[PDB]
Design a protein around this ligand. Structure first.
Ligand SMILES: *[C@@H]1O[C@H](CO)[C@@H](O[C@@H]2O[C@H](CO)[C@@H](O[C@@H]3O[C@H](CO[C@H]4O[C@H](CO)[C@@H](O)[C@H](O)[C@@H]4O)[C@@H](O)[C@H](O[C@H]4O[C@H](CO)[C@@H](O)[C@H](O)[C@@H]4O)[C@@H]3O)[C@H](O)[C@H]2NC(C)=O)[C@H](O)[C@H]1NC(C)=O
Ligand SMILES: *[C@@H]1O[C@H](CO)[C@@H](O[C@@H]2O[C@H](CO)[C@@H](O[C@@H]3O[C@H](CO)[C@@H](O)[C@H](O)[C@@H]3O)[C@H](O)[C@H]2NC(C)=O)[C@H](O)[C@H]1NC(C)=O
Ligand SMILES: *[C@@H]1O[C@H](CO)[C@@H](O[C@@H]2O[C@H](CO)[C@@H](O)[C@H](O)[C@H]2NC(C)=O)[C@H](O)[C@H]1NC(C)=O
Lengths: 148, 596
């Protein structure tokens, strides 16, 4: 299909437009063999963790970018879209994982494993749910608001 | 496998949930504070119940991990805090009675009240009508009558309640490790483990006594001046060799003698230091009173608040249909949701309180990167000291003249400096001996030293000598002055005031030294100088990760509190203070009583 990147600029006032292998201004004058798009929502303070080589809580367990990355990263604020007073617990993220995650790989698991020494074999000592939700609210400040 | 990492793997699991629960509890509290309704208080109590219950399970969970494999100060503090703050040692038969006695004490302090002498008309509470007469209304008979009516209507029936509460609280305290309930309040400044910073709770009492002895030479001269002025005003009862009647202290229990300062005026030709008129003159409203405060904070390096803070902060009492509380209180809702609930309309006191609240908010903001359980770096003495020093620095006439609150025509002559220094002294040295006496008396009571039938006997024995204030009416064991207090009935410590009294002066002298400001401690203006602001921000962001003694050494230098900043802050005042006090009797007659 014809890939027009002009519709992306006026769609939203993005505050992060990092591009690694291509200068953004030339994006309209290039052709590519294949294009991949991935979408997810995270908190503000984790936005910096989406970069090649960078190591953090999200990168080590949820989404790891390979060093040989030639794409672009776009992030724009979506606080008013998904903020509720009760709590936006519908979104979930992995609180902690036993092992490192391979780049460009995903893990869908919720088995309560023993993060200790004595085998838990169920909820108890150092045996916790891998996933954990969070209650986004409109009254929250920057860093604890939904970001697309 | 080692318990050191097991503790952290348990911690990070519940840290987010604890943050969310604390945020929800604070949200319900702020909602009830803004919305005074039965459902709002129900939501307060329910959210508090969930938070307390979660702390109840967290206490056992922390007790599961032994503390002998823990060496990190962060992990040690986080594990120990939940062990005691989320559990109780008293059994149901005793804990239920302790809670009931606390609730009854609070109710009797609030519901129990007295009003106009011999009149079944509309009445007023302590602060609205009684403590108002004690504070500003300079009238011997009214203050003398109220000073005993309030205690006979509140402290009288609360005396057995206060005694039983002392016994129950001691039963709670001595069980686990403490020797009294005063050991609980002395633990706010205890430092152990770290080399070069060690402390003992027993030595804190000695330090307080030494500070009282240090302030005694100034306080006796202040007492002489106050007694001379009282004899000039009311020679009928006050003797030239006796103590000060308690009612003639500008309040019921003498802490801030600001109205008593008016009678003891050094110079009648005092120029205008009041910028309350300038608030109307220069079009000052609720927003601006905080806006120039933020400008001053930025000029010293402290960043301002976000627009979201201003869109969730109540700077003016709503009134109308949904009434609220005008008491100054800065609110930190959690997760960067700072709020406020106070009043700032037309007065300079609004400006000072705005600086107070802004300093508190900035202090809480600085350690946001610290862990939630370590967000208790807000040492009450240090926190109040920062809040007071920011207002003290912003209250200098140089800053007001530069901003526009004052004018360069007005000058800091001898009359002006003596006047405001002595006005501050009548509130600082006015409360220092009384605060020390109250702290020592309550420490001894919780230790059981004071007999239950001789509470007022020892109280007045110390008041006549240590405080140099004798009761205007023959108060006896029937009533209980401490029990008729808000903090005591609500079971609140008062060592905070005594600690902050010296902490603020230490902070002020440290700021002036770091900024290398040219001027005395009573005219230290560091508005556009941010050099001391850098070290202040470092101390602010230190949080509860280092001992407060270490921060004091890094900023002030002295691990323990020192009166020398107070001494050289009041030295220009002391020059005039010496002249007008050696004429009168420096001592006081303990045996003499105002009631003939
Ligand atoms: C262990 O758990 C206990 C509770 O179980 C925690 O105790 C709480 O500690 C906080 C932190 O100090 C307390 O919050 C402070 O309360 C002070 C008491 O004020 C009372 O009186 C005023 C009237 O003047 C009332 O309006 C008020 O509602 C209280 O009833 C306040 O004075 C403090 O405010 C100060 O700071 C703010 C800035 O935030 C300024 O705006 C103010 O002017 C003032 O300078 C503060 O709000 C809380 O009250 C304590 N609770 C109880 C029940 O005592 C321990 O902290 C915790 N220990 C840990 C976790 O280590
Ligand atoms: C005692 O406990 C404290 C509290 O956990 C330990 O502080 C921790 O120190 C490590 C090492 O710097 C921090 O890891 C860092 O993580 C960030 C991402 O969050 C990463 O970018 C850095 O490169 C680094 O890996 C860790 O965050 C920090 N803890 C907290 C809560 O912030 C301290 O190390 C402990 N003492 C000892 C001797 O280990
Ligand atoms: C801090 O610096 C500011 C910036 O110059 C000062 O504000 C100006 O001060 C001069 C002289 O006092 C006035 O003529 C200007 O009108 C002021 N500017 C504004 C916008 O009001 C301020 O006075 C300085 N304060 C201190 C304490 O040095």
């Amino acid at each position: 299909c014809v890939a027009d990147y002009s519709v992306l600029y006026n769609f939203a006032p993005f505050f992060a437009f990092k591009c690694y292998g291509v200068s953004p201004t030339k994006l309209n004058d290039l052709c590519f063999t294949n294009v991949y798009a991935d979408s997810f929502v995270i908190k503000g303070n984790e936005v910096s963790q989406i970069a090649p080589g960078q190591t953090g809580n999200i990168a080590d367990y949820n989404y790891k970018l390979p060093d040989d990355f030639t794409g672009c990263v776009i992030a724009w604020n979506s606080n008013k879209l998904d903020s509720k007073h009760s709590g936006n617990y519908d979104y979930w993220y992995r609180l902690f994982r036993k092992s490192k995650l391979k780049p460009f790989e995903r893990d869908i698991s919720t088995e309560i494993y023993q993060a200790g020494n004595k085998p838990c074999k169920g909820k108890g000592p150092n045996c916790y749910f891998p996933l954990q939700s969070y209650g986004f609210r409109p009254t929250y400040g920057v860093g604890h608001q939904p970001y697309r | 496998s080692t318990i050191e990492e097991q503790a952290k793997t348990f911690l990070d699991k519940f840290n987010h949930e604890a943050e969310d629960l604390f945020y929800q509890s604070s949200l319900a509290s702020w909602n009830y504070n803004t919305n005074i309704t039965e459902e709002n208080v129900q939501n307060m109590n329910n959210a508090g119940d969930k938070w307390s219950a979660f702390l109840k399970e967290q206490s056992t969970l922390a007790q599961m991990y032994p503390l002998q494999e823990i060496q990190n100060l962060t992990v040690k503090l986080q594990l120990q805090a939940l062990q005691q703050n989320g559990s109780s040692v008293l059994s149901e038969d005793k804990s239920k009675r302790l809670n009931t006695i606390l609730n009854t004490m609070s109710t009797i302090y609030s519901t129990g009240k007295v009003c106009n002498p011999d009149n079944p008309q509309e009445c007023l509470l302590l602060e609205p009508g009684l403590n108002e007469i004690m504070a500003n209304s300079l009238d011997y008979n009214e203050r003398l009558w109220a000073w005993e009516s309030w205690r006979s209507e509140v402290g009288k029936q609360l005396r057995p309640l206060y005694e039983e509460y002392v016994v129950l609280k001691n039963e709670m305290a001595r069980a686990n490790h403490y020797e009294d309930y005063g050991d609980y309040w002395r633990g706010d400044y205890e430092v152990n483990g770290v080399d070069g910073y060690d402390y003992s709770r027993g030595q804190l009492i000695e330090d307080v006594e030494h500070t009282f002895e240090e302030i005694k030479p100034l306080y006796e001269h202040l007492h002489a001046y106050v007694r001379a002025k009282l004899m000039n005003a009311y020679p009928s009862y006050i003797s030239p060799i006796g103590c000060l009647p308690a009612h003639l202290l500008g309040d019921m229990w003498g802490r801030f003698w600001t109205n008593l300062y008016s009678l003891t005026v050094p110079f009648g030709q005092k120029p205008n230091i009041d910028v309350t008129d300038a608030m109307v003159d220069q079009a000052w409203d609720a927003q601006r009173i905080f806006k120039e405060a933020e400008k001053f904070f930025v000029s010293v390096g402290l960043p301002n608040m976000t627009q979201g803070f201003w869109e969730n902060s109540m700077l003016t009492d709503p009134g109308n249909v949904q009434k609220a509380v005008c008491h100054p209180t800065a609110w930190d809702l959690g997760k960067g949701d700072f709020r406020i609930l106070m009043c700032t309309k037309v007065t300079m006191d609004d400006f000072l309180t705005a600086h107070h609240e802004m300093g508190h908010i900035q202090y809480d903001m600085a350690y946001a990167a610290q862990p939630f359980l370590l967000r208790n770096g807000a040492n009450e003495g240090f926190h109040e000291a920062v809040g007071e020093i920011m207002s003290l620095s912003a209250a200098t006439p140089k800053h007001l003249k530069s901003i526009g609150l004052l004018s360069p025509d007005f000058q800091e002559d001898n009359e002006t400096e003596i006047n405001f220094l002595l006005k501050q002294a009548l509130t600082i040295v006015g409360t220092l001996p009384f605060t020390y006496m109250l702290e020592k008396w309550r420490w001894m009571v919780f230790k059981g030293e004071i007999p239950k039938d001789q509470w007022m006997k020892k109280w007045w024995e110390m008041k006549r000598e240590i405080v140099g204030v004798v009761e205007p009416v023959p108060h006896d064991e029937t009533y209980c002055d401490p029990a008729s207090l808000f903090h005591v009935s609500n079971d609140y410590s008062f060592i905070r005031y005594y600690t902050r009294t010296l902490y603020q002066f230490q902070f002020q002298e440290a700021l002036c030294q770091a900024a290398k400001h040219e001027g005395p401690l009573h005219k230290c203006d560091i508005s556009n100088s941010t050099e001391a602001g850098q070290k202040l921000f470092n101390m602010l962001r230190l949080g509860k990760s280092e001992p407060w003694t270490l921060a004091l050494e890094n900023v002030v230098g002295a691990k323990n509190m020192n009166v020398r900043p107070l001494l050289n802050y009041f030295e220009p005042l002391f020059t005039w203070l010496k002249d007008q006090n050696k004429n009168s009797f420096v001592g006081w007659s303990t045996d003499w009583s105002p009631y003939a």
